[PDB]
Motif scaffolding. Structure first.
Motif, PDB file in Angstrom:
ATOM      1  N   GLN A 102      34.463  44.416   2.786  1.00 49.64           N
ATOM      2  CA  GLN A 102      34.464  43.753   1.468  1.00 49.64           C
ATOM      3  C   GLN A 102      34.128  44.849   0.453  1.00 49.64           C
ATOM      4  OE1 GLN A 102      31.051  40.937   1.698  1.00 49.64           O
ATOM      5  NE2 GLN A 102      30.190  42.289   0.099  1.00 49.64           N
ATOM      6  N   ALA A 280      39.205  43.955  -5.787  1.00 49.53           N
ATOM      7  CA  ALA A 280      38.215  43.436  -4.817  1.00 49.53           C
ATOM      8  C   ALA A 280      38.904  43.206  -3.470  1.00 49.53           C
ATOM      9  CB  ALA A 280      37.621  42.154  -5.329  1.00 49.53           C
ATOM     10  N   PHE A 281      38.160  43.386  -2.373  1.00 49.22           N
ATOM     11  CA  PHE A 281      38.642  43.306  -0.969  1.00 49.22           C
ATOM     12  C   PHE A 281      37.796  42.338  -0.139  1.00 49.22           C
ATOM     13  CE2 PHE A 281      40.138  47.207  -2.770  1.00 49.22           C
ATOM     14  CZ  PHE A 281      41.475  47.165  -2.426  1.00 49.22           C
ATOM     15  N   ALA A 282      38.428  41.798   0.901  1.00 50.69           N
ATOM     16  CA  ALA A 282      37.854  40.877   1.910  1.00 50.69           C
ATOM     17  C   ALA A 282      38.295  41.334   3.302  1.00 50.69           C
ATOM     18  CB  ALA A 282      38.309  39.481   1.629  1.00 50.69           C
TER      19      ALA A 282
ATOM     20  N   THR B   5      34.470  40.538 -10.069  1.00 50.37           N
ATOM     21  CA  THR B   5      33.794  40.280  -8.772  1.00 50.37           C
ATOM     22  C   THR B   5      32.664  41.294  -8.550  1.00 50.37           C
ATOM     23  OG1 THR B   5      34.458  40.754  -6.478  1.00 50.37           O
ATOM     24  CG2 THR B   5      36.235  40.402  -8.092  1.00 50.37           C
ATOM     25  N   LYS B 145      25.978  40.225   3.764  1.00 55.93           N
ATOM     26  CA  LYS B 145      26.684  40.684   2.553  1.00 55.93           C
ATOM     27  C   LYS B 145      27.212  39.446   1.829  1.00 55.93           C
ATOM     28  CE  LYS B 145      28.742  45.352   2.952  1.00 55.93           C
ATOM     29  NZ  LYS B 145      30.131  45.854   3.023  1.00 55.93           N
ATOM     30  N   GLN B 147      29.804  38.363  -1.767  1.00 55.32           N
ATOM     31  CA  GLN B 147      30.738  38.868  -2.790  1.00 55.32           C
ATOM     32  C   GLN B 147      31.253  37.650  -3.553  1.00 55.32           C
ATOM     33  OE1 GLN B 147      33.649  42.321  -2.138  1.00 55.32           O
ATOM     34  NE2 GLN B 147      35.086  40.577  -2.300  1.00 55.32           N
ATOM     35  N   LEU B 163      32.263  34.784  -1.069  1.00 55.52           N
ATOM     36  CA  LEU B 163      32.437  35.355   0.281  1.00 55.52           C
ATOM     37  C   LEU B 163      31.041  35.639   0.812  1.00 55.52           C
ATOM     38  CD1 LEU B 163      34.834  38.175   1.448  1.00 55.52           C
ATOM     39  CD2 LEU B 163      32.397  38.211   1.941  1.00 55.52           C
ATOM     40  N   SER B 204      34.689  36.486   7.760  1.00 59.82           N
ATOM     41  CA  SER B 204      36.173  36.620   7.864  1.00 59.82           C
ATOM     42  C   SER B 204      36.523  37.626   8.962  1.00 59.82           C
ATOM     43  CB  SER B 204      36.844  36.973   6.545  1.00 59.82           C
ATOM     44  OG  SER B 204      36.424  38.230   6.028  1.00 59.82           O
TER      45      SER B 204
END
Lengths: 365, 361
Positions: A102, A280-282, B5, B145, B147, B163, B204
């Motif tokens: 993330q 942004a990343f996941a 974000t 974590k 987000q 998240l 995830s």
């Protein structure tokens, strides 16, 4: 008091301990990518006094001696096998791309310099590069590789003035201050003249009064503790990820480059005087999970049409943009000093103005 | 759509273990000797922890013992790590000790005068951690974590995505775990009076049993955006944890926050960012920039006037004004250094509103 708008950025030299670590991190990465373009590298370095600890996680078919590589970075800076103990706790192994972490990255570009970078950054880097060139040619004698610069620019008027150039350079015990101060002043005036700026600014040279000890010796350095020197010198935002020692699958690095490449091309195509791009990343997601295009009310066409042209002109697939920027065959050691962006002295894929044609066409002209 | 974000990380995150050990050692020194000089850095690599840096103190400090006092409560025992020190320790200059730039930032989106993305990200992890400690949420660990993506397209912010990634026991129930995280996300949303129908992304990666430094690395000062303004405010590059107040990287960053927050609280601007630059030997900042992002409720020039008249820019003086020699730093080594309505930080006090209002006429 009212004053004036005074923005400031800094750079550091190759002998700065934070940057020694970034150099060793990326040299080990370069060594791996030479031999195995599928290498996974997350290599961190601590330089504490006379102990250098190389750590992290490597998966590679490459033969790599992490300690030997570290000495190959250190020795040219003037140190010998008697100066350090260097040890590894690196965990080395053999055997579409989703993000592996993330997080957020930022790309930034502006029109103040041919580099499409803030003037504060460019002047700070250029100072240290010229001092380092002169050290290597013995044009400037009795100095060493640890140095810092800081440039303050006055943006009160249409035309930027230089307010202050500051330098700190490690010198030999037996140096001539009069010589040293004359050399630094002339170098500061040379850099100013090169970007067609004022000559009459305040000069601050080795204000501490003495700088013989440097590098890690009294001190600590760590990988990724110069992440603002490495990027946009406080003009652009940052998401917090460090670059050095990371292979392209870490989106902290490759997405930060991808975003720069967009930003630079947006400004080059005369769509905006400044452009900042947040991704942004996941974990597991092949594209950015979010995107923000900031143009700071400098857009020369509609904000909405800029956003359209970016989506149409670039592939946001992580595996694809990695390949489009040839990040598997890019040398990273050269960007471990003097910043990752606007390097008209290098040949970085993410600095190429090869998307202006596409943005102009895809902006309904 | 305009989608900003930000992220946070838990106490068990290896980058934050190092920040915690750095500040615990600082707190241990300042307990005994309020004149301590501390520049303490930590590397956590797999099962080796190296404590390093430069300490001048009259205090008796066992840096390794202090490191174990941070580690053991996260669930580890004496068998999990080797912990070694190369700290250069000793007993017994005017103005700044370093060159550099810092940035203070404030806005009116939250009671904390912080960006909503940050606050929500921190609050998620604090509630998960509170529930872990009270065994309200079982079979989880301390590495985590968050987000949070917020949609600022309109007058009213929407939540777009929350998240979360939380370290779990081998034998956890996914359905239980996902229900617990969903309910915590909805609870945090309801607490800031936000929408309840956003995208929820829960572990995830599909699996998170190994965590902390194990098979990984952490270092002091590698969460400098989590520690500050979550990408909304600019950054000068200085890390906070393990540094005594004489490092302007730390004290000036606090000083600047204190200004920014008070500028916004005094209704002079909806947002305020303050850049301070430093030079070695200079008792004040060598430069200052006040950005108000065209949200100033009075003239930009009069805001600058009121700041210079209302605050002491002498480094030694602002250090003393913020009681930085008697402030506990371990509490700000998790969940950020700014807008901590759950703490009592001098640089978060709205005790300069009266001075800025008067000094703006």
């Amino acid at each position: 008091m009212q004053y004036k708008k005074i923005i400031t950025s800094e750079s550091v030299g190759a002998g700065h301990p934070d940057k020694i670590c970034d150099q060793i991190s990326d040299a080990i990465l370069d060594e791996c990518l030479s031999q195995d373009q599928n290498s996974r590298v997350a290599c961190e370095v601590l330089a504490c006094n006379r102990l250098i600890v190389i750590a992290g996680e490597i998966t590679t078919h490459a033969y790599v001696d992490v300690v030997k590589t570290a000495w190959e970075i250190i020795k040219p800076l003037g140190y010998d096998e008697n100066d350090f103990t260097i040890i590894s706790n690196v965990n080395k192994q053999s055997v579409l791309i989703g993000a592996g972490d993330q997080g957020i990255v930022f790309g930034y570009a502006c029109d103040e310099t041919p580099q499409y970078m803030p003037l504060t950054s460019v002047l700070a880097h250029e100072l240290l590069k010229e001092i380092e060139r002169q050290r290597r040619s013995k044009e400037f004698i009795k100095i060493q590789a640890d140095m810092k610069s800081q440039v303050s620019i006055d943006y009160s008027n249409s035309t930027p003035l230089i307010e202050t150039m500051l330098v700190s350079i490690q010198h030999d015990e037996d140096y001539d201050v009069e010589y040293f101060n004359k050399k630094v002043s002339a170098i500061m005036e040379q850099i100013a003249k090169k970007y067609n700026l004022n000559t009459n600014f305040k000069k601050i040279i080795n204000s501490s009064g003495r700088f013989v000890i440097g590098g890690p010796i009294g001190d600590t350095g760590l990988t990724g503790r110069k992440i603002i020197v490495d990027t946009y010198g406080g003009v652009g935002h940052h998401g917090g990820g460090a670059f050095s020692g990371k292979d392209p699958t870490k989106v902290d690095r490759s997405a930060s480059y991808f975003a720069r490449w967009i930003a630079k091309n947006v400004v080059a195509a005369k769509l905006a005087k400044q452009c900042e791009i947040q991704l942004a990343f996941a974990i597991g997601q092949p594209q950015p999970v979010a995107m923000y295009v900031n143009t700071f009310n400098t857009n020369l066409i509609d904000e909405t049409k800029i956003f359209e042209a970016i989506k149409k002109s670039f592939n946001f697939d992580i595996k694809t943009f990695i390949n489009d920027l040839n990040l598997w065959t890019t040398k990273y050691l050269p960007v471990a000093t003097y910043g990752h962006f606007g390097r008209d002295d290098l040949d970085l894929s993410w600095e190429k103005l090869n998307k202006v044609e596409d943005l102009i066409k895809n902006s309904k002209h």
